[PDB]
Design a protein around this ligand. Structure first.
Ligand SMILES: *Cc1c(COP(=O)(O)O)cnc(C)c1O
Ligand SMILES: *Cc1c(COP(=O)(O)O)cnc(C)c1O
Ligand SMILES: CC(=O)NCCc1ccccc1C
Ligand SMILES: [Ca+2]
Ligand SMILES: [Ca+2]
Ligand code: NA
Ligand code: NA
Ligand code: NA
Ligand code: NA
Ligand code: NA
Ligand code: NA
Lengths: 322, 317
């Protein structure tokens, strides 16, 4: 019915489990007191590469074919220069194949250097999408690689869904999962998984109000991407949902909660100070959601809530003051 | 053997406190394993209630010690500390439904006073001298039918800290060594008593700043050699010297002491933030720095499974 099935999520977890961490679920008395709820924190900030994106990236590397005539990818290519690019480079290294990141000339110098230091090759493009696409397609074809989209690629979505297999196993009495949403690869993967296994468990999305396409899409009942590039401290959720994740989100996600920039900042600081976990602000989005006024509308029966702390890739010097 | 505590006291403390403290997780790190050549296990006391292990000793003391009064239960706690110790004692007081008073010089800055009140301590003012601090604390303790609790030499505190090792031995059955930051040595002594009672083949190693190397010097000389003057170190939590109660335990039951430079502490603390995403305070970086140090590299390869106590996460941000 959708672009992935629960079977694909299980194939993904078989494919990746030898190379990822079964990350712990931690608790906090303090956050329990603040929210009214029994919270559980799925600690993907401790995952290999610093975020959950290694799940989808490694599944893609281990499951996708470059061509009808070649079963083994000979390179990986992406336009992601964030957590996805980092994860994809790690996955490529594991599999002994080169990684190429397509990067606009306008990218910051510090980022160009970091990409290279981590062991990816940079291929430069113009800031234009026309050039970006020309360059990446060319790289993919010439290197016999796989292009791996950060959120719309079925193998990626399936890999991210493995988070939910772990959460359900780790928290048998869980009532809901709260998931930050950008392109919706993680949300969609989780939603497929939870609804296949235990549909009584709620799946809630958490999104910046400054980048509220998932909320607006669910509201309108059709895919409504951000018209303009969003401004938000939650740098990891600036992507809009897309054609492959939207149908899953429309049908299988129970509710969306939007949170202000101040709410994201305060929740992130709370996690830092009271939980001693170095989450990136993007991973504070789910925490802000459960703390938010609108979350009070969630039935009191929904008691045990697992929040995905999706990443810990923060630059400390910059995060001294926002 | 005989010391100010035995393992029996640690077992008592465990029963006294377990219902109110977190059994903190033990986490691992591939990169730190790769840097050290060992199998490392991180006992996450930074996730303990109040942000450090000190709630263990503090709660044990509040539930053990008696005031100089008719009634057996303390009616308040009184402290000089606005740090990990005082914050622990304050939380213990809240659990027991009694006020926590902190004696503060009248001249203290407004920001410090606000910080103190935030965690729920009640300020009583004194004059800015050691004489006035002592005398005000004595008065308040007596008038409120309260107790005071030494941060590292109090037997009830030493016994409480030992509970760290009780958990570690359960969580890491094949552990070969514990690495423990040492200041006053309440934590080191409690842990040493516990380990040597339960599984004496397991090594107990201390870690301290080379800028505050009284433990190392004391073990070398075979006698208590306190820091001659208050040390300067980023590891704010281990500025105290070992004392008369913890020294004999450390002398007899601690296998070795590793010293680490300020740069090593800072770098280890950064490595843990960046690579482990754990907001340890620099004092908790001391034990990590120890296991990364050149001296530790030479430790027998048989000592493979090493548990480092990440003692606290109370850092100013
Ligand atoms: C990518 C990412 C997300 C969102 O994932 P999508 O599949 O794009 O919705 C959330 N948090 C972090 C840290 C991420 O890196
Ligand atoms: C108090 C403290 C120590 C040292 O404990 P002692 O019993 O004084 O040796 C170490 N780390 C932290 C975080 C502390 O608060
Ligand atoms: C902030 C920064 O430098 N991000 C780059 C992340 C990245 C992307 C692709 C490959 C490798 C890395 C480190
Ligand atoms: Ca969005
Ligand atoms: Ca010392
Ligand atoms: Na192809
Ligand atoms: Na599973
Ligand atoms: Na239920
Ligand atoms: Na589709
Ligand atoms: Na003080
Ligand atoms: Na005693």
């Amino acid at each position: 019915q959708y672009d992935i099935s629960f079977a694909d999520v299980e194939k993904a977890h078989i494919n990746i489990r030898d190379s990822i961490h079964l990350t712990p679920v931690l608790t906090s008395s303090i956050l329990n007191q603040l929210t009214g709820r029994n919270l559980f924190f799925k600690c993907e900030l401790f995952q290999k590469t610093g975020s959950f994106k290694i799940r989808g990236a490694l599944n893609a590397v281990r499951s996708l074919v470059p061509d009808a005539l070649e079963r083994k990818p000979k390179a990986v290519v992406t336009h992601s220069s964030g957590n996805h690019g980092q994860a994809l480079t790690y996955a490529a290294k594991l599999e002994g194949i080169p990684a190429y990141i397509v990067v606009p000339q306008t990218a910051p110098d510090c980022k160009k250097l970091a990409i290279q230091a981590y062991g990816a090759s940079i291929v430069y493009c113009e800031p234009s999408d026309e050039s970006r696409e020309n360059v990446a397609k060319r790289v993919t074809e010439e290197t016999e690689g796989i292009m791996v989209h950060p959120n719309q690629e079925p193998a990626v979505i399936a890999g991210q869904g493995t988070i939910a297999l772990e959460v359900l196993n780790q928290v048998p009495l869980v009532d809901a999962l709260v998931v930050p949403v950008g392109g919706g690869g993680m949300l969609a993967g989780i939603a497929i998984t939870v609804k296949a296994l235990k549909p009584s468990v709620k799946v809630y999305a958490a999104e910046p109000s400054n980048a509220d396409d998932c909320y607006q899409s669910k509201l309108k009942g059709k895919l409504m991407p951000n018209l303009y590039p969003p401004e938000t401290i939650a740098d990891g959720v600036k992507s809009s949902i897309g054609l492959n994740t939207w149908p899953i989100i429309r049908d299988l996600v129970d509710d969306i909660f939007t949170v202000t920039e101040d709410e994201i900042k305060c929740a992130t600081q709370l996690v830092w100070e009271r939980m001693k976990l170095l989450i990136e602000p993007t991973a504070g989005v789910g925490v802000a959601a459960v703390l938010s006024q609108h979350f009070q509308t969630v039935s009191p029966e929904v008691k045990n809530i697992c929040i995905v702390l999706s990443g810990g890739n923060v630059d400390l010097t910059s995060s001294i003051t926002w």
